[PDB]
Design a protein around this ligand. Structure first.
Ligand SMILES: [Mg+2]
Ligand SMILES: [Mg+2]
Lengths: 64, 113, 135, 189
RNA sequence: CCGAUAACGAACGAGACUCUGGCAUGCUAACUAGUUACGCGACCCCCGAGCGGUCGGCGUCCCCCAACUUCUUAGAGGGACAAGUGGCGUUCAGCCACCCGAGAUUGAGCAAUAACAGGUCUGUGAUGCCCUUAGAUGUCCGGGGCUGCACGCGCGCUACACUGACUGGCUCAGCGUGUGCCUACCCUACGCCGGCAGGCGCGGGUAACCCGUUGAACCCCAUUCGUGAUGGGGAUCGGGGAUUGCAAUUAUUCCCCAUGAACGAGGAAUUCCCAGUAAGUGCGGGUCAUAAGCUUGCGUUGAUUAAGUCCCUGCCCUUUGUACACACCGCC
């Protein structure tokens, strides 16, 4: 029943958010399917190309 | 003090100086103390070059009401001989020599000397 | 970040690229040595900065015309502005297209009925002007 | 081939997930004889990625004031802990370390400034470098607290923390803190 | 800075500058700095090594009786400029990444207009006015006080331990000081006495010559302890012994033996900090007859986190509102 944990790759880093700069909005493309690319916000040091793991796919999205 | 400082200021400029500044501060006029600053010309304040272009003297005038301080700063003119003042140029002054024509647009020849 | 060149380094650079364009080049080192006989620069960190921005202008002046002048560029500004006179003028059209009203006006001047003038069919619809407001 | 501490070859360990593969540095290029090199790894950003992780673990054990420069003491602590885990489990000590880092890094956390429910507001997935940074910090704190007032030495307390983290048994302080971070993030999605 | 431009031409500040750090096997040199070489030794060798290994043992400016400047010192110079490549940018000003490079942002000093009823009359033979001036508010001498303790706060030191303490062994610094106008008071090698603090003789240094190859601490390597207020911690207190001084009581400081208290990581709050940084760790300078838990510098070991934001506290620019101008700690 539970959506399985997966792995997504950062195509571009949109910029900082959270009004303290702790979170960076990034554009993650799912490796399982290159077509599905969603925007997330991550905390910590980030750069293009690195792959982060996603406990669950779709939470929130917003343009800055 | 207004007239005396102006006369001092005019003497310094006439003698040849890039700038000057006199500040006579004390119990001028009434009991409340004020400072009068007469400044004209260039007058740097910061950096090392202050050490070799400006001359500062602080004097005390014991008038009846109290002590009336005097601060005089004179920026000396640059002089290659350096007797009248500093010999080093200001560090940020770049002076470019003027070239001649040096065109030579004519036919090439050989001068047998 | 924080390597903007102050006025002095830029302002000195422009003077020595108009005084001495021919001697200078696109090498930081060759130019940094000319700046040692053409100018009395008090500081070493200043000439290398001056020499550095000179290359940026000398690299740029080889292509575009930077505001700093140059005789060889100015003579071509002259040659193109003052010459390339077309052998056939643009204002010698063999046939001059003419609105009916202009032909009427030229008729009043009594300079109408010239052969070079050719009347044109007047436009119809009076559809000039742009639709008012947005949309 | 480089034999870290003169043994424990580096050309056999492996990282089970590509998410952390490029911020762990146990392979041949970042294989060193000893976890000690003043390599200027904090000069710029993502230079601590190419710092070998044994060096990263060593740099994090020197904490709580008493031990702020004592890298030689920490190197022998890592050396003694690595000898124990190979003896106590039977596989390559580096392999246990990489599994410990992989298994201890909290996959998501929570952070915001608005009016929080319990701790933080919005659940945010962490970066792969924060994964390693948190994993190393959690293991060291677990070994630190476990040996603060007991006869068991730092090397043994560090040894069991990496062994427990490499498996995940609700016994390592690191994974216990990791599971707690997941629950807060999950409850604060 | 680039650019538009009712502005044009300027001035100060910033920047440039000065010092410091990092590289120069390139130059100048060094018996007040050394290194290599050679010659003596002293040992271990010995198989036999022999241009063997070690020596901070001794010589070769004890001028004819080595060279050289790598290491040390300090002068003149060089070097780094966003210079080169790629990308972004109005392709301008510039920004990002990378190669080569010691270095692609080392730290300080100086630091504008205007102002504060900010601090100093206890720095001055700086000073106005006022006060006192022989039973002095002058000056000197003796004693006491500035330390006094129901309590509150601030800067710190020591800790709560085993990532430790203890005992022994091993092994590494750098700033910098050193005998005094008055002015009395210097830094100390070596030998002997003592358990220690110390004492007694002999020297060296006004100093790259002597202390001093500053044999520092942490650290390192072995020992004992073993999770207990314990060999943690050393507060309090008793006895005794030295040093300084004219004088040590209200203990100057130091040493020795005893007592071994709170303290088991600290509520609300709150400080500082981005790379040789924080922190651990000692060492010099100032004060100094006597003395550092202070301060100013120095070296040693050496990280976690971050390359962001305006959320909190504030700053800068523009627009806006205003009943404010002692200016929101305002006005009402
Ligand atoms: Mg400046
Ligand atoms: Mg004991």
């Amino acid at each position: 029943r539970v959506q399985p944990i997966k792995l997504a790759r950062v195509t571009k880093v949109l910029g900082r958010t959270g009004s303290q700069g702790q979170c960076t909005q990034v554009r993650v493309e799912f490796m399982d399917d290159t077509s599905r690319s969603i925007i997330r916000n991550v905390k910590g040091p980030v750069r293009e190309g690195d792959v982060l793991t996603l406990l669950e796919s779709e939470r929130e999205a917003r343009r800055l | 003090v207004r007239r005396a400082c102006y006369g001092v200021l005019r003497f310094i400029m006439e003698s040849g100086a890039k700038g000057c500044e006199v500040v006579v501060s004390g119990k001028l006029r009434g009991q409340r103390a004020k400072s009068m600053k007469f400044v004209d010309g260039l007058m740097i304040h910061s950096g090392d070059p202050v050490n070799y272009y400006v001359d500062t003297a602080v004097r005390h005038v014991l008038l009846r009401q109290g002590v009336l301080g005097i601060k005089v700063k004179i920026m000396l003119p640059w002089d290659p001989t350096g007797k009248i003042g500093p010999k080093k140029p200001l560090p940020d002054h770049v002076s470019i020599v003027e070239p001649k024509d040096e065109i030579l647009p004519t036919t090439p020849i050989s001068e047998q000397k | 970040m924080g390597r903007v060149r102050t006025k002095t380094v830029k302002k000195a650079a422009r003077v020595i690229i108009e005084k001495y364009y021919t001697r200078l080049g696109n090498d930081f080192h060759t130019n940094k040595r000319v700046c040692e006989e053409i100018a009395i620069i008090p500081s070493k960190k200043l000439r290398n900065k001056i020499a550095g921005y000179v290359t940026h202008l000398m690299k740029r002046i080889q292509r575009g015309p930077v505001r700093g002048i140059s005789i060889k560029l100015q003579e071509e500004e002259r040659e193109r502005r003052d010459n390339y006179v077309p052998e056939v003028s643009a204002l010698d059209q063999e046939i001059i297209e003419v609105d009916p009203d202009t032909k009427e006006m030229l008729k009043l001047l009594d300079f109408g009925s010239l052969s070079n003038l050719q009347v044109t069919q007047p436009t119809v619809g009076m559809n000039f002007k742009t639709p008012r407001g947005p949309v | 081939d480089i034999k870290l501490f003169g043994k424990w070859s580096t050309d056999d360990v492996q990282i089970n997930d590509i998410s952390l593969q490029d911020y762990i540095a146990v392979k041949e290029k970042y294989a060193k004889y000893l976890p000690h090199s003043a390599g200027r790894y904090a000069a710029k950003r993502f230079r601590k990625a190419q710092c070998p992780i044994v060096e990263r673990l060593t740099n994090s054990m020197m904490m709580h004031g008493r031990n702020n420069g004592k890298k030689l003491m920490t190197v022998r602590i890592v050396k003694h802990a690595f000898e124990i885990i190979h003896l106590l489990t039977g596989e390559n000590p580096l392999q246990v370390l990489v599994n410990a880092i992989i298994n201890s890094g909290p996959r998501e956390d929570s952070t915001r400034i608005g009016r929080a429910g319990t701790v933080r507001r919005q659940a945010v997935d962490v970066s792969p470098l924060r994964r390693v940074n948190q994993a190393i910090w959690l293991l060291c704190t677990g070994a630190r607290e476990a040996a603060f007032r007991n006869i068991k030495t730092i090397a043994e307390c560090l040894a069991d923390e990496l062994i427990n983290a490499a498996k995940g048994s609700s016994n390592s302080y690191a994974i216990k803190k990791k599971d707690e971070l997941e629950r807060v993030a999950k409850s604060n999605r």
